[model samples]
Target chain A: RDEAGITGTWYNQLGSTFIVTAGADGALTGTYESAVGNAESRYVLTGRYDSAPATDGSGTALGWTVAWKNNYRNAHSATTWSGQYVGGAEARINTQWLLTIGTTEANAWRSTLVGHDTFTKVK
Target chain B: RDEAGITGTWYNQLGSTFIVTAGADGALTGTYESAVGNAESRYVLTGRYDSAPATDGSGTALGWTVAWKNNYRNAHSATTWSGQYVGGAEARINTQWLLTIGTTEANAWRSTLVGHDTFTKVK
Candidate 1:
């Protein structure tokens, strides 16, 4: 079979926070971060949001250099990680993005922190 | 609302290849990579595999500095991203892990490359 397994966090339509684990087919699954115990999503931009238009949801939305977050419960407690956006350099069109995770958890319940990145097509 | 979204690629029981996107509740959805069109999964250690036991899939299996991979299709064409494993430096006992992606895609297809990292536990 052929499938792309990508995962990471992004701001949903609402300003709320949501963690996403997407498949090669764009089918994603995961939980949203809350405001209780380490239950919030955070995007990091070492600088500022570009004065670009939200045309197609492309381009550097943040100014900084990295995006970070903490899941409500990685496995049973919480999960966290840091990621970078590469495609941000691409044209702001139908750009493509990828995500990565560098953490590993055995409990699959205590915490599952993984590093991630997203590439967006600009042109 | 109460879930964790973790994503990445892992060698399934079979040497085949599968993309995984998990949620806060451990609910995963994704596709598998075949050896046809940019198929097969790649795990780069930039080093070597540890002489440790199989362990609980918790410790660092590879002695490399970073782990990377590519997916078959991102949205419709192809989705790709590179990730690092960080938690590997932790203790190897029911350890916790984190996965991050740094790529952004608007077309939701064509090319979606995101930067990612995964923190692994050692004890």
Candidate 2:
């Protein structure tokens, strides 16, 4: 039984970070903070994961998918994150994501904004 | 050595698809087509990858990152995709991404737009 390895803290180059915890049922709960610009923002993160076979089916370990949501200042955001365990490592996961932030008055009242983000586990 | 597993075709829920090919050196070349709306759009995709360990260090497979760019109608877009090989599968990649589309005259001459997208290998 392989474990979902996304637990703990992750950091990005832009000073944003994720403090994540994985539950036994593959649910993920966390906090995300981005201090990249003049305004600092924090969010409550929630998601679910699955230990599915890699869509590519190239290895012997379970790949994973996480669909999560967050909210800040009444603006909602959601993310779809997926990754596989790195070979020859203990807790490394390679991940990619699409994060969509809903339209908010804070953003000139524009439409939803989407972002691509990545992270390497820190601890 | 683990293959990148993102080769072949992938389809999303919105009728967009990726026709991808992986080189022996972990380079990816592909075409992405989206026909969700009235406008049909296609893109040229290119990127590179590595066999690094997963950031979580939980498995024995090389995790990967792929940075690719495309342009259509003078509108440029780039994607940073990352993922790991699925355990017990062949040619499946569990991936997440951030895609940024540069501003273009065709889009009301607005600023850049970012999107979050995911794909499941279909063929």
Candidate 3:
């Protein structure tokens, strides 16, 4: 049923884009750019998926979780991404991401960002 | 099978602690404090769980994902927490969290922080 159909490059309205390549071991690797706020340059993304339903009766799709980082600030931080694919060439990704900023020193911080990230295969 | 045994307070060596309350529908609500490097501040956390094995050959347990925010800086961020419970009052939670920093502006940034988080349930 080609459950892992989330491969290729996808762009968003926020000017942020990602190039995802799904692997055989359920690993999804890619490069991501954060263009909205911070305009935080480019970073690498790693993710995994489980053969589960992304929605109720939404077909036997796959749910995924991804993580990445843009260490261009004095204080380092990372982002964790969680969402699922509807399974198709033109896929819709509903994701909720969290960003944590700071080192182990002091004054570390965190915040939450939610949005709908969609992707279309271009390759 | 008393799947939601992760309803309580837990402490770690980093001086960080979390008080979790599990819901009947696999939702976990909690409060978390980061006492490490930034020592930024306290924040609220929310999470969910799936009835799955935390490890192979491990007894049937629940896998979980939690998130929180510490918005005390000009740059905002959030943390996504993912782990699994060993199932019991004296449960051990192995976790990996990602932090993303920045707003919807230019100059926003992110970084990656990895650690082994353990939690002991307390009444």
Candidate 4:
């Protein structure tokens, strides 16, 4: 496989689209098109991934982030995702993400969303 | 303990320093002072962390990055670290990082650096 380990197009159940490109050094830069949010549909993303997987072909850890800014007040926020590719007959990325809004006011931990997403390559 | 899970000053053997702040929403932003590179001495870092540790206080995953830009030709680079906080009598963060230079030309993966560093909390 190319050094761009998981370089390809991806999608989630929420109708989100990601076009990921991994550099030879594992620098991850991509475009994400989202379907469920107030922010614009397209975004630029940055992060990194494990250049090499484990002996079993499973330990490629991937992480990325997106700063989502929109016209909605109190909606400027950032989200970071920690992910890994589980390899096999079908390779997919399983990621855990946390989204935090741009605010200093105290907000409940529950107010921030921590969720898991599994993205599969369709192309 | 203040929602800033691993909030404090830290150091590694390479004479690098990091002052990290973890927001309640798990947004991680920090400062890193390094003595080992050609880039400026200080850099503002950004990434994320696992807000809630395991019941045993051990599963905190942290990740951050720094873009090192210098005067040297073809020296602009970016580094991303994937880390975790291991709890015990001595709480420390062990991080794995990948650094990629800015270039369109092909270079051996070996030319890029992938390394690990252990950071101990000093304050």
Candidate 5:
């Protein structure tokens, strides 16, 4: 399954679940169930995977975007996780995510959030 | 309007329109109406702006995602456009976008599409 990489369920440290499958031409489709906060439910996931090394020289690079549906707290919001897969005895995917949640106070300098996480393949 | 940057409507060559507002913490929320293709209606747009320059040194970097609604062609799909606001006599945003549309045949090397465009401030 080495060549058929990045197709499986992955989990973050907080136990968030991601059911993903990589389609031909790097097409990525998946569903994400968050294990945290009030807006916890299945959100649509779509992205792409590049077999080439990440621009940062990490593992094989891939990126995905999540559309927050039924999230009433914010008028509009979405999150994008850009990551790279590490191939080893135990594989890992490291990512940096940018979350833009809803409309906020204009000219203020603090609504958007950024974080990092490492996900492990569980199934 | 230098400090209140990236808050307005923009148009590309094909006349596709983007109405965006920059909120506190670099949050970006917008509505995009495509002027080409089957997706000719309005779609949801959400993203971020980093007054900081893009890593590639293009301009003031910004990024956003579009969630497709009522799209029958693909069961699930989304697009993310990462761009730079170029400051010049006439302002423009230069961008590269990745569109991951629906699922595809597994293990193939080409469904994800990438494209480039430049948008001019129209409002």
Candidate 6:
């Protein structure tokens, strides 16, 4: 994620897409738009994901949670909110228990809940 | 075209769009679909332009013509086929021109004939 300055819209292994803008804090927040309904959302940048996937249509097995926001609306919720950024691909990230927010919890399921984007200066 | 890998589709300064794919020789061949019509042209990789324009929608005054092919089926008609790439934005490209092809003549009219696109490695 750090090397390529990775950031863009993400499509899940199950076909969900979300906008993950990168921020100064490492990961930016946005909405998880639908894969089926083609819905547009004013999604919150719930938190940051620590790992990226190896391909466009695979699931990520994130092992770390470096940081996150407490709410989609709040930025200064907890100490872990500003946690450090460690890197990994979708197959291999190594850290734990960084940040939590709202009803969304970070575990194997929720870590895989999000994905990163492919970015370019031209785009 | 050379330094930044200037390739992709373009929306015209007049709002017409065309898919311009660049090739190894310099200018990639493509069909200017709507500004003319929905003619599925099997365009040969014609030639490159020496100068880039100064902006996205304005006119350009190119100074040279390097090399170009003849049709959707020919590639070796001219030695200028491997013309050099002089870089330019939508505007202000100097020392340019290295290609030509088809009925689309490259002067002030066709040099501004097509446009480039915004690209991302992960889009």
Better of 4 and 5 by TM-score: 4
TM-score of chain B of each: 0.24, 0.56, 0.68, 0.83, 0.80, 0.31
**Top DockQ prediction, candidate number:** 2
Against the hidden reference, what TM-scores do the models get?
Answer: 0.23, 0.39, 0.43, 0.51, 0.50, 0.21
The ten-residue window of minimal lDDT in model 3 chain B covers B102-111
- The docking category that best describes candidate 5 is incorrect
Those runs of model 3 whose alpha carbons end farther than 4 Å from true positions after fitting are A1-123, B2-4, B39-41, B51-75, B88-90, B103-110
Native contacts recovered, each model: 0.11, 0.20, 0.02, 0.01, 0.01, 0.00
Q: Give the TM-score of candidate 4.
A: 0.51
User: In candidate 3, what are the lDDT values of residues A1-123, reduced to their tens digit?
Assistant: 223466777676666787777655334566777666544665555454432222332422122232232345211233446544444445555445544332221222212233445444432
Better of 1 and 6 by lDDT: 1
**Per-residue lDDT of model 6, residues B1-123, tens digit only:** 231333555443334333444444222344332233222333222222212322332221111111111233222111111111223443212111112111211221221122222222221
Q: Model 6 segments beyond 4 Å from truth?
A: A1-4, A36-42, A49-123, B1-123
After superposition on all C-alphas, the RMSD of every candidate to the true structure, in Å, is 14.6, 13.0, 15.4, 11.1, 11.6, 22.9
lDDT of 2 by residue, B62-86 (tens): 2222223234344344545555555
Task: Report how far residue A77 has shifted in candidate 2, in Å.
Answer: 8.2
- Superposed model 2: Cα runs more than 4 Å off: A1-123, B2-4, B35-41, B51-72, B87-91, B103-116
**lDDT tens string, model 5, A52-81?**
332332345566766454333222335676
Query: Can you write out model 4's per-residue Cα lDDT over A1-123, one digit (the tens) per residue?
Result: 334447888887787888888777556777677767656666656665545443433335556766453223223444656655555556677666655442222332233456667787753
Please give the distance, in angstroms, between residue B91's alpha carbon in candidate 5 and its true position after superposition: 13
lDDT tens string, model 4, B5-115? 388888987878988887775566777777676555666566655554434433355567664532221234456665556655676776656554432223322324566
Per-residue lDDT of B9-55 in model 5, one digit per residue for the tens? 88988788998887654556667787776575676566655533323
* Number of the predicted model whose TM-score against the real structure is largest: 4
lDDT score, candidate 6: 0.26
Pairwise TM-score winner, candidates 3 and 6: 3
**DockQ list for all candidates:** 0.08, 0.12, 0.04, 0.06, 0.06, 0.01
Question: How does model 2 fare in lDDT?
Answer: 0.50
Q: What is the C-alpha lDDT of each candidate?
A: 0.28, 0.50, 0.46, 0.59, 0.58, 0.26
